[PDB]
Design a protein around this ligand. Structure first.
Ligand SMILES: [Co+2]
Length: 376
């Protein structure tokens, strides 16, 4: 059923709470092909919080830290989670309706709709509490023509190394995954259905995604127009500990496990990301032998050179109409929590259990190296 009013247009931005915003922004710019977009801090009159905002295509990351000793909210979050996603922002139409509807359905409103303004126009915001300590910020632009948002100025520094690095060709945020503790997948996903009038887009249980040792369950929620997709995972039974449970152990609770970034040229993207020193998960040579064999009878034709995919360790999955190319980075911090994915879609707007399985297996290999694939 189509929601009466309101519309979630798309992912607006992801906000990270990190120990060192300056160095985090440098990491994402140099290693992942982002560029400075905006800044707030002591020099712009923001005296409690510093934010470095960076962008690639439509992808916008906000890296924020506390400026003062003993910041309780940001300090606690940092100690509990380490560097990680705090907020997922959605650009919306009719923020007021969305908030009112969410409130009536029982969502916790961390911040009532307020409006900010600069010379480029007005923006209305609201903040809702989702799983764990993660929030959603709703962004409604009211004839706003700025490059980002009110309260942020031009970048503090334009790193002269950046233009000398190869372009990574990342275009937009494709989906964002939230890991939940044991038995909280349903309640976490229902939150979207009930409060935001999302619907169930896809799901897998532990009989569809598992290795010889561990498994998960997942439900993907999506907005009506399906421009926003968010897999919600929980651990599931196995001889050994699910990687979802490893996440929860190290995150101290529910939170965002990965952000997938879409590209229209994944060969170029991964080659350039590797040249910049980004690390990715690995896949055995046998996978590509089996892949070539399977493609002989497939209804689709993969256009990327398989040798290149194999070289770059890109995973392939397909249905009868199209295919998906996906790859995970290693975690972007030392705790095995947050990582990133690069995805290219070819006439395929969903997810594939094939890739979900291979990715799950590729990640479980690293969980084992961390000594956390332990018997249950
Ligand atoms: Co993903």
């Amino acid at each position: 059923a189509k929601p009466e009013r309101g519309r979630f247009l798309h992912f607006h931005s992801v906000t990270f709470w990190v120990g060192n915003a300056k160095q985090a922004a440098s990491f994402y710019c140099s290693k992942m092909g982002f560029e400075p977009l905006a800044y707030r801090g002591l020099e712009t009159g923001s005296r409690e919080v510093v934010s470095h905002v960076i962008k690639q295509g439509k992808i916008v990351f906000v890296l924020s830290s506390a400026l003062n000793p003993w910041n309780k909210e940001m300090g606690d979050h940092l100690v509990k989670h380490g560097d990680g996603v705090k907020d997922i922002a959605f650009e919306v139409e009719d923020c007021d309706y969305i908030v009112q509807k969410a409130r009536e359905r029982g969502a916790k409103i961390m911040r009532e709709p307020w409006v900010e303004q600069d010379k480029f126009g007005k923006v209305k915001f609201a903040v809702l509490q989702t799983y764990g300590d993660t929030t959603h910020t709703l962004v409604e632009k009211m004839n706003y023509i700025g490059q980002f948002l009110p309260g942020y100025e031009a970048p503090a520094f334009m790193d002269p190394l950046l233009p000398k690095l190869p372009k990574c060709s990342l275009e937009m945020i494709d989906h964002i995954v939230g890991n939940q503790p044991d038995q909280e997948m349903v309640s976490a996903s229902e939150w979207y259905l009930k409060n935001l009038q999302f619907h169930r887009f896809w799901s897998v249980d532990d009989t569809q995604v598992h290795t010889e040792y561990s498994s998960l369950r997942s439900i993907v929620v999506a907005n009506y127009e399906e421009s926003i997709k968010m897999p919600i995972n929980e651990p599931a039974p196995g001889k050994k500990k699910s990687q979802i449970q490893e996440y929860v152990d190290y995150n101290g609770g529910a939170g965002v496990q990965h952000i997938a970034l879409k590209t229209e040229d994944i060969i170029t993207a991964i080659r350039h990301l590797r040249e910049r020193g980004l690390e990715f998960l690995s896949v055995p040579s046998t996978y590509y032998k089996q892949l070539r064999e399977k493609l002989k009878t497939a209804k689709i034709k993969v256009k990327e050179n398989i040798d290149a995919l194999e070289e770059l360790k890109i995973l392939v999955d397909y249905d009868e109409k199209g295919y998906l190319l996906q790859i995970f980075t290693k975690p972007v911090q030392d705790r095995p929590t947050l990582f990133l994915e690069v995805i290219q879609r070819h006439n395929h707007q969903g997810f594939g259990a094939g890739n979900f399985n291979s990715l799950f297996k590729a990640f479980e290999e690293e969980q084992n190296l961390r000594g956390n694939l332990t018997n249950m």
